[PDB]
């Protein structure tokens, strides 16, 4: 269309959400959602940030401080 932009690196996307005991992860392959949990031992996740250089995920916990 000469107006839309798409990513050269594969369209596959990773989306991460923080919900109390789970760092929910969704993997959008094609347009199919795939849902799994990153870590078992977490208590109350509040803030999530992603680091591309190491390939790491950072999160803060309200109960563990």
């Amino acid at each position: 269309d000469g107006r839309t932009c798409k990513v050269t690196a594969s369209e596959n996307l990773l989306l991460v959400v923080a919900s109390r005991d789970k760092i929910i992860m969704d993997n959008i392959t094609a347009h199919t959602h795939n849902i799994y949990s990153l870590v078992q031992d977490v208590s109350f996740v509040v803030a999530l940030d992603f680091d591309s250089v190491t390939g790491r995920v950072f999160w803060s916990d309200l109960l563990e401080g």
Partner: protein, 65 residues
């Protein structure tokens, strides 16, 4: 999702590549990117420290608080 406080998206497109000003620096505590030209970098000491005229070094305390 019962308690979705935080959300992050993880793709190579969300952390675009850029040259690093700090790689050239050698200050002893912290190097931070800066909008000010031409260095585009500045150095920061721990909370409570001073910064010497030698912009790459820091001095500590010596005053009541």
């Amino acid at each position: 999702v019962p308690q979705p406080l935080g959300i992050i998206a993880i793709h190579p497109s969300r952390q675009p590549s850029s040259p690093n000003p700090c790689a050239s620096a050698t200050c002893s505590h912290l190097c931070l990117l800066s909008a000010q030209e031409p260095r585009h970098y500045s150095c920061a000491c721990p909370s409570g420290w001073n910064l010497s005229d030698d912009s790459v070094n820091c001095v500590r305390g010596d005053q009541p608080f």
